[PDB]
Amino acid sequence: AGADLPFTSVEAESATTTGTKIGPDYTQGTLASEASGRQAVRLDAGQRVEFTVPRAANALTVAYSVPDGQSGTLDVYVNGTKLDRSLTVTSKYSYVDTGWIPGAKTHHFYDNTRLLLGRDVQAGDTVTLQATNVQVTVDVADFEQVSAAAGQPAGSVSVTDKGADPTGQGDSTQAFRDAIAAAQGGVVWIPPGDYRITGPLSGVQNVTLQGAGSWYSVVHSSHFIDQTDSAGHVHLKDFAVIGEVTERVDSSPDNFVNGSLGPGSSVSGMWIQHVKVGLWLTGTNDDLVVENNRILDTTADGLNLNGTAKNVTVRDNFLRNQGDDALAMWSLYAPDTDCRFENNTITQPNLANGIAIYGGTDITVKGNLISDTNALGSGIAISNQKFAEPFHPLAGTITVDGNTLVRTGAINPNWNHPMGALRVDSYDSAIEARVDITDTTITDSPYSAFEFVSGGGQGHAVKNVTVDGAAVKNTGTVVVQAEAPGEATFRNVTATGTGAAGIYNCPFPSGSGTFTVTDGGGNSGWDTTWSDCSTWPQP
Would you tell me which residues interact with Ca ion (CB under 5 A)? 11, 35-37, 39-40, 139-140
Q: Phi and psi of 17, rounded to 5°?
A: -145, 155
Separation CA 401–CA 403 (nearest Å) = 6
Q: How far is the CB of 407 from Ca ion (least distance, A)?
A: 11
- Provide the b/e sequence for 81-105 (b: ≥16 CB within 10 Å): eebeebbebbbbbbbbebeebeebb
Separation CA 315–CA 313 (nearest Å) = 6
Please, which residues bridge with residue 466 across strands? 436, 489
Q: How far is the CB of 408 from Ca ion (least distance, A)?
A: 16
Separation CA 26–CA 38 (nearest Å) = 7
Alpha-carbon separation of residue 477 from 62, 374, 538 (angstroms)? 33, 16, 6
Q: How far is the CB of 38 from Ca ion (least distance, A)?
A: 7
Could you tell me how far CA 80 lies from the centroid of its own chain? Answer: 35
Under 8 Å between Cβ of 366 and 382 = no
Under 8 Å between Cβ of 375 and 350 = no
Measured from the CB atom, the residue of 40 and 236 that comes closer to Ca ion is: 40
Closest by CA position to 254, among listed 274, 228, 275, 271: 275
Measured from the CB atom, the residue of 62 and 225 that comes closer to Ca ion is: 62
Q: How far is the CB of 325 from Ca ion (least distance, A)?
A: 22
Under 8 Å between Cβ of 412 and 103 = yes
Cα-only R_g, the chain:
23
Measured from the CB atom, the residue of 140 and 190 that comes closer to Ca ion is: 140
Q: How far is the CB of 11 from Ca ion (least distance, A)?
A: 4
Q: Name residues whose C-beta falls within 8 Å of residue 70's C-beta, 6 or more positions apart in sequence.
A: 90, 91, 134, 135
Composition of the chain by helix, strand, coil, percent to 5: 5, 45, 50
Closest by CA position to 361, among listed 380, 381, 340, 342: 340
Q: Phi and psi of 382, rounded to 5°?
A: -110, 110
Separation CA 391–CA 384 (nearest Å) = 9
Q: How far is the CB of 23 from Ca ion (least distance, A)?
A: 8
Q: How far is the CB of 241 from Ca ion (least distance, A)?
A: 27
Measured from the CB atom, the residue of 114 and 237 that comes closer to Ca ion is: 114
Separation CA 363–CA 271 (nearest Å) = 26
Measured from the CB atom, the residue of 37 and 193 that comes closer to Ca ion is: 37
Measured from the CB atom, the residue of 40 and 406 that comes closer to Ca ion is: 40
Q: How far is the CB of 90 from Ca ion (least distance, A)?
A: 19
Measured from the CB atom, the residue of 139 and 325 that comes closer to Ca ion is: 139
Q: Phi and psi of 121, rounded to 5°?
A: -70, 165
Q: How far is the CB of 62 from Ca ion (least distance, A)?
A: 11
Under 8 Å between Cβ of 317 and 294 = yes
Measured from the CB atom, the residue of 137 and 258 that comes closer to Ca ion is: 137
Measured from the CB atom, the residue of 51 and 530 that comes closer to Ca ion is: 51
283: enclosing H helix or E strand: none
Measured from the CB atom, the residue of 11 and 142 that comes closer to Ca ion is: 11
Q: How far is the CB of 351 from Ca ion (least distance, A)?
A: 19
